[PDB]
Amino acid sequence: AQDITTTLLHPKGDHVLHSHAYPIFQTSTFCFDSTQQGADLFMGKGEGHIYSRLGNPTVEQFEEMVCSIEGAAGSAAFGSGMGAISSSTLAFLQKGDHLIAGDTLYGCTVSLFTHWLPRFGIEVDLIDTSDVEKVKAAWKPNTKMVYLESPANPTCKVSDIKGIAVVCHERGARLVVDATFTSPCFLKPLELGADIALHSVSKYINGHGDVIGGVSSAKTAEDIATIKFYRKDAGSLMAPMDAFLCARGMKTLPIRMQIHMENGLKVAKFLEQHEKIVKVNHPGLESFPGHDIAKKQMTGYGSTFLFEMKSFEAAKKLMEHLKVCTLAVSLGCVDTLIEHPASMTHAAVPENIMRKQGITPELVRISVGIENVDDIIADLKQALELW
Amino acid sequence: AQDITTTLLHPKGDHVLHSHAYPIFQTSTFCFDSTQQGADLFMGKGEGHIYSRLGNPTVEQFEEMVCSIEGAAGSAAFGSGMGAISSSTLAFLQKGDHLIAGDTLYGCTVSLFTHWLPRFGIEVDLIDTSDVEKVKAAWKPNTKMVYLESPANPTCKVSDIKGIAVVCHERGARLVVDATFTSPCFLKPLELGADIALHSVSKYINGHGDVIGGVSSAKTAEDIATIKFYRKDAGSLMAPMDAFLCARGMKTLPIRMQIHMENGLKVAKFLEQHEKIVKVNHPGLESFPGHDIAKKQMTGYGSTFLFEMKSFEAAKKLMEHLKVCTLAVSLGCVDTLIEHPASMTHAAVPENIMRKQGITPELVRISVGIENVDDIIADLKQALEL
Amino acid sequence: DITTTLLHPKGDHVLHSHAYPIFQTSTFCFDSTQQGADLFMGKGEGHIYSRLGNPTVEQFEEMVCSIEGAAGSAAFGSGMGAISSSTLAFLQKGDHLIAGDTLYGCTVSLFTHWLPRFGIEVDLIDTSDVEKVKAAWKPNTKMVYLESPANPTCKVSDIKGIAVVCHERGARLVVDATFTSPCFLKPLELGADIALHSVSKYINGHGDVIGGVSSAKTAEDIATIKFYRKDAGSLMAPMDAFLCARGMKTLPIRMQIHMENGLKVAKFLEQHEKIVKVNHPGLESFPGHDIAKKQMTGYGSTFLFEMKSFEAAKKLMEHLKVCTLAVSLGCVDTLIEHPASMTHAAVPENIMRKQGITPELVRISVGIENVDDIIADLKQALEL
Amino acid sequence: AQDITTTLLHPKGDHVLHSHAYPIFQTSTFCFDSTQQGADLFMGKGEGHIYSRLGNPTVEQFEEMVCSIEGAAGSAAFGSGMGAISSSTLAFLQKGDHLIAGDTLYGCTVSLFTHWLPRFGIEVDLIDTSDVEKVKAAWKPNTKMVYLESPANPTCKVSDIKGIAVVCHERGARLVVDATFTSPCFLKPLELGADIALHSVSKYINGHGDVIGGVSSAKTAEDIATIKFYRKDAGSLMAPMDAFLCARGMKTLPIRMQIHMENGLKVAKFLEQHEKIVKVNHPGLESFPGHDIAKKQMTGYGSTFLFEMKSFEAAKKLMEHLKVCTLAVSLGCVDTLIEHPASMTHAAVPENIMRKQGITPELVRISVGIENVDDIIADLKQALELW
Ligand SMILES: CSCC/C(=N\Cc1c(COP(=O)(O)O)cnc(C)c1O)C(=O)O
Ligand SMILES: CSCC/C(=N\Cc1c(COP(=O)(O)O)cnc(C)c1O)C(=O)O
């Protein structure tokens, strides 16, 4: 069986005009040969293109690469991870439906689920999905979907994706998994029983900190068709240039992830043994609750994780005196980023949910890049040992 | 009174690193000076950027350009006209609300209002908005929005935006106008009393057929903040490169529109007097119902319009023997496009709505470009002779 | 008209795409050894490697070629790349070049510093007078190189008359028509062998690309130019060619506006008490107007005018609110510069005097803004 | 000392408008504050920009990255490797000067030195530079430059860069080295005594097969200023978009080269032991002449090399029956390329020079990518073992 490195470098499809790199189809529309040919494409008959919102060759090339690593029936690219998330939930959920979602989610996902979904008559509970019994207890006759992020942003809380998938499968609910934090090299939710696997491509998949985009992949042709139908009307599109950039970043995804995984673990171990650090939430550490599940259900770890300092002042002093790490939000970039969730990525999260998420002023999140790991550790060490 | 040509070519804002052209900020994230500075930005305090989904300087420069021409409090750019439409309606409407929309709308707008909105518990009635009395009769206690396209895609049906805005003002509803077909050079819905004006930037605004994008502009600061809050979560973003291309295309928008307008009128009059053509639906023709309203409420016309052949066979002959015009959906490009609405742009609209729209297999939609008109007419004359 | 031709270029669509795709690629795949071998021998149809040929760049080349009436066109990474490729592809040690005495600063640098290092004799002379061209002629003269109207003074050379001299005497005539665009000046139509442009100016028109183009009357000459380019390596990037082709779609319409704005502005300046003299080729007062009127079908909107002192020029250039102080020209928005300390600052003193470039001169490149707004900007800056 | 991976990911310079990724300055011109500020910039006084041909911020960012890895006084980026080679030779050589260049060079370099330089009154000899004594024997009173490619394209012939540099330094000649085949990760000619080190950035540096570009770096400020002065008039520029892409590709250069090097050596060893293969020219093999010089003077190897089949027909059969390798010219891409030098990259090389270079119809050149090496080897093996 051919390695994923090779698969990503050799995607299926004809070359265009013998071009080795796939061209950028910076076009809005496409030409018809005849009234019939154009009519037929609008009915889904024949091969070809109509209009970039319905399908653009460069974006489709990126979709096929993701589809190939997810093992999906199809993938849909979007203008952002939030586009993928809206389109993977609201394409299916309608008034009177019930959604169970993790209680520790990316801030704007909490915003979408707690502000917008209830306005559309959709019932939403945020539940601790690290415990399958709590998921079952929150289940209702109208539950149509469970939505999980695991490991969760930013605390890395692990959910039992396989265990929850069994209950979804028995009860007729879709299981949707945001695998952004781990990448499809290491977490393949469709292999664990999910119906839909999605990512912010803005993070690891693209990897170069220069594109916002999203992708969603479905286990069935019907589900990916419905998602694309929603996309056509909701309009979160990946631009041709951004698709060219995402496909290009993904060409190095397997080797970047290997380096991220190993750097991340080494940085977490360094932090865990350091006297200034109270606790390290990296799901690859034996000390981490849920390490046993992550180890079984994933084939590696991402390199974004959280650690606890002794105070807010210690956290600030660390974050502001680094020379290699960059103070900024986002994650999954080739270079190391660091931020303060309580006052940044999660500052818009309701106090109620903040308290249950376990997010405090002492926490710092680091997204470890592919720099030489000793250089990253020496940067953290000099800031930690400051006068 | 500085002219709009000059305004578009001289947008407000600082140069970046003294660059003459505005740089393409192909970035996802921005760096913070300190914890406090990043925290302040997240609370909307101070000046700066955080992350391109929240705000990208290249995208914002294009937003400022549109905002100036619309006379708006602010503008939001999107990944498509459908992103703008979605974000300008679903940012406000919620379960139990009622929407009144024009009966003649772009096909996917029909799909949005007719398939997705009701799944979200929003009641929707499509009605003939060319008669303000029919809008009044359709009104309900829970009516929160009227949504109009004028002239409508593809029949060019005209609504009294001004009269309808009075009714919305009186009865506590937002008026949203899709002004894609006319461009903001010739139609400024916020000057007519609308609350929101939006475009498929994919059409005239960009004008070069190489970008898909949307823009929406609101009369009030609170409404544009809501639109952008919805955009934050829904995620239809204009890419930095596309914003660079849309701003660049918009630099020639006023001259392109002058030519489109003059060209489309000349073509329509040629077709109207030709023996093979049953009727021509251009809002700038004296024969067109709604001409009197379009002339008073607009300062010009787009060049996309519809005409009727004597049979489907005839329309097919004409569409397939043109050498200059290109058979393709979309409109408002520098070159001439031609389309068959029944089986293309409006193929998916339900039979009953299609009947109400007056769309038949005999209709052909042309989007007249900025070619020498004599070439477009000769191309048409050529084909009609076969 | 020209607009229809530029909007409907010849060629096939790629994958039915309406906009021509951006071939952001270095290399192309071969179907077999034989097919790749054949392409390297110039047999069959297809591509090998973007330096030899890129489809997006070739589409832009074909657009310029059609408008110039050429046998072919070559795109480059800058106007300087087109210039050095249209001259050094032909001239060799022992050859002599006659060049206009007033040229863009970097062309002066090329001809004055580099060409003589390569054993090429160069005389800069006043090409507004054909007898001076004849008098400078030598048995080893192989090329005349003209800019008309010249940058920055707008000095006009008789292209047609010089072409007759060149044809009779076995020399190539190369014309840089940057200042006028191919809508208005078509040197190959006047007898020239090669016509070239800084695409960075009018042709692109949007101030966001640097590029060059050269067009040759003969198939053999464009082959030589591309052969030189293959080894010298000044290429137009596929993204820049996409942008250039895109800007060119509005070229004829922009040029009509530039021309009309520029004339109205020159006329305003010419009757202003603060202005000594306006060098615009379309003015009746300008020496060489009669040639320019006969050999061109319009005018660009870049031209020079004379203030009463350096201090006055500085005051004018530093109080404009619409016009931007920057080098370059032919952009949609109005640009203004000081040739003596900017574009022409490195020109040797003696060539400078021969050019007539003094610290009292300001060069303006009138954009497509409403002319009344640009006149009001100049007006307040001249009077307050 | 900080690792090169870290340096490339953290290049010196201020961020622009706090942007994490460096913006694309798609501009021709820049604005002046005043006539004095503009006048000064033209005199080289003060900080700022004028016009992209003279200096573009995005291009300068990429130049700084190369300069940092070369250990140079400065770097200049170009529209192509050939722009870099032209500008690194013709910026210095004039009529009456003499150039000694290697006899095995990239085809278009042979075209430049053999067709264009003599037209400009520059004397050129192509010499076997793998023998320092032959270089000395070719020396004349007017010799001003030696130009080397090592390992040479496509035979991998190795020159003694250090030994030749001694002779250049004693006699007042510049040494110019095209290090395209090896990359600046493994070959740093300025540390071996070269005055100028240059690359086709089109190959490894960019790495992604989607840009043509060049770069040249000089040991002295004076020489890089002269190179840029030439560039200003000859006009081979790197476009702002291309510079953004080259900088982006270069963020993964160290990890890509590590994999290229390891894959290329394993493929060479596989080929060297295979019955169908007559000889393998990879400078990292102990069997290769000049292996001892390459191993002392480089810190690794590129993964483009040539091998000899038993016949032209055998080469064609191999080249036309691969599923992973792509038949195409160029090299140094993430995916594996293969070509036939005799009829492709070197088909324009004059017969006498071909014979001097040792290029025959039996030779195949492979540029090994970063695919899983076992997939690459299995692809070659199945083609070699065809019916
Ligand atoms: C507060 S601003 C920083 C962005 C960010 N996270 C993003 C993200 C998204 C959304 O993806 P989009 O940004 O729309 O491509 C979806 N799902 C997950 C697990 C995510 O981590 C962060 O820094 O924690
Ligand atoms: C059937 S496919 C051709 C697209 C098309 N029209 C689009 C359009 C949109 C949507 O804008 P987006 O396409 O999302 O940028 C919004 N509003 C109006 C009046 C529109 O006409 C057409 O060819 O009639």
Ligand SMILES: CSCC/C(=N\Cc1c(COP(=O)(O)O)cnc(C)c1O)C(=O)O
């Ligand atoms: C001092 S820097 C400003 C650039 C400039 N002129 C350029 C130019 C070129 C060169 O074109 P490239 O810049 O290489 O695309 C060629 N030919 C002509 C008639 C030109 O005017 C100027 O502002 O006068």
Ligand SMILES: C/C=C(/N=C/c1c(COP(=O)(O)O)cnc(C)c1O)C(=O)O
């Ligand atoms: C198709 C190109 C091949 N080579 C190129 C090359 C260049 C020239 O570099 P641009 O191509 O001008 O960037 C310079 N120096 C070296 C050692 C090279 O290999 C090839 O062999 O396959």
